């Protein structure tokens, strides 16, 4: 069956360039028009390039015209995308896809390759405790958290009490904040549980080799 | 430049339910050759889009006959006669009559009973303030449906500037964090901080506050 495998994505500084490849198998590659389609972090799909079956004709939207070049090697069953003068808005998952023979469309897509364009340097996160506002004598359940701010690149990993505190935890997806990443996690426990028992967020940022624990104390 | 718009944004369903999603194009999708190149795709998390319906109503290879498409000109709909768990994900329409463009996607998700959020507000930590920064955080946990409106109010005035929100994926409930990031100096400009949530479950907002000087 038809298979497409994209590769090559990585981090590149703004103004820089990168080449993506897309290996095709299970069909006569040379008979089909091929595309590159990307999906942004907010999950919108955007067509970025088209190439005719034989390779002579290439098409691009205005957002990419003059910076991207789609190409293909029909002997090796490879589709390519050279990206020049990269901008932060080019950050996204890149897919190659095939044009069916009897209608204009996209029948098969690959699993994708991620591209990130940023001028940030590797930075370990700051880990701040989110303890409840002081003075709560209700005896109701308490919600605690950890704020993991200013790291790059992704990702980070977060556990509570080395993973033994797994229920009632919400770890939110990272957001780009000051050209760096930020995430948070919350954990909810009965009031007889904390602060009598310690609660600690365990944070890891592989890229900076950071491994830190932050015990959450009351205000 | 043909704009593709999907309705609804999200469509919660129970297993076994019928499902309908619409896709509106800014201009006719009829090609000069008479055909309408309007397609539907399903994308599951971590996977690429897969073709479901091509050229308005043609089922792609392997697609069950539970899926059907129709519509004409500029208004099209994808139907699921009976929803199964494997159907859940985001459905996208696209058009290939002009240079390819895609709708924003309709997420098909599992219906749950309505649930109000549990709201908790957190002042900046001592640690961050020592550092010169001030993040105020609010968690809005375990609610349903997903639509929720959150407002930061400082001495009664709304603040949108510096607010970033992050939503957890679908228990079947949703959760969300809102973080207002200020400098220490800005944070010290005001004393009353409130995180206010408006959700379908109630006519009244859920308000959680603290005072910088307490």
């Amino acid at each position: 069956d038809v298979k497409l495998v994209e590769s090559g994505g990585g981090l590149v500084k703004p103004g820089r360039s990168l080449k993506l490849s897309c290996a095709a198998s299970g069909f006569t590659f040379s008979d089909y028009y091929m595309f590159w389609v990307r999906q942004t972090p907010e999950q919108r799909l955007e067509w970025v390039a088209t190439i005719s079956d034989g390779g002579a004709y290439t098409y691009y939207p205005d957002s990419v015209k003059g910076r991207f070049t789609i190409s293909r090697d029909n002997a090796k069953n490879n589709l390519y995308l050279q990206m020049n003068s990269l901008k932060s808005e080019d950050t996204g998952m890149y897919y190659c896809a095939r044009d069916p023979l009897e209608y204009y469309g996209m029948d098969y897509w690959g699993q994708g390759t991620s591209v990130a364009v940023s001028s940030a340097k590797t930075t370990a996160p700051s880990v701040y405790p989110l303890a409840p506002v002081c003075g709560d004598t209700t005896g109701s359940s308490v919600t605690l958290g950890c704020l993991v701010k200013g790291y790059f690149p992704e990702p980070v990993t977060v556990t509570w009490n080395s993973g033994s505190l797994s229920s009632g935890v919400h770890t939110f997806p990272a957001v780009l904040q000051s050209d760096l990443y930020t995430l948070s996690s919350s954990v909810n426990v009965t009031s007889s549980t904390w602060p009598s028992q310690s609660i600690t967020c365990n944070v890891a940022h592989p890229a900076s080799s950071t491994k830190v624990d932050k015990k959450i104390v009351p205000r | 430049n043909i704009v593709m718009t999907q309705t609804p944004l999200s469509l919660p369903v129970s297993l076994g339910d019928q499902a309908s999603i619409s896709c509106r194009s800014s201009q006719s999708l009829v090609h000069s050759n008479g055909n309408t190149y309007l397609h539907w795709y399903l994308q599951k998390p971590g996977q690429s889009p897969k073709l479901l319906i091509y050229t308005v109503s043609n089922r792609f290879s392997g697609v069950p006959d539970r899926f059907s498409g129709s519509g004409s000109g500029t208004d099209f709909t994808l139907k699921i006669s009976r929803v199964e768990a494997e159907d859940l994900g985001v459905y996208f329409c696209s058009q290939s009559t002009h240079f390819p463009t895609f709708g924003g996607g309709t997420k098909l998700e599992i219906k749950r009973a309505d649930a109000a959020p549990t709201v908790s507000i957190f002042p900046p930590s001592s640690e961050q303030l020592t550092s010169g920064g001030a993040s105020v955080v609010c968690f809005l946990n375990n609610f349903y449906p997903k639509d929720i409106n959150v407002k930061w109010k400082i001495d009664g005035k709304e603040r949108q500037n510096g607010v970033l929100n992050s939503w957890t994926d679908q228990d079947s409930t949703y959760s969300m964090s809102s973080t207002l990031t200020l400098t220490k100096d800005e944070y010290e400009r005001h004393n009353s901080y409130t995180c206010e949530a408006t959700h379908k479950t109630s006519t009244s907002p859920i308000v959680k506050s603290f005072n910088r000087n307490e």
Partner: peptide
Amino acid sequence: ANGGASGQVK
């Protein structure tokens, strides 16, 4: 036109 930005109809 046949072949173009959105593919072809062979």
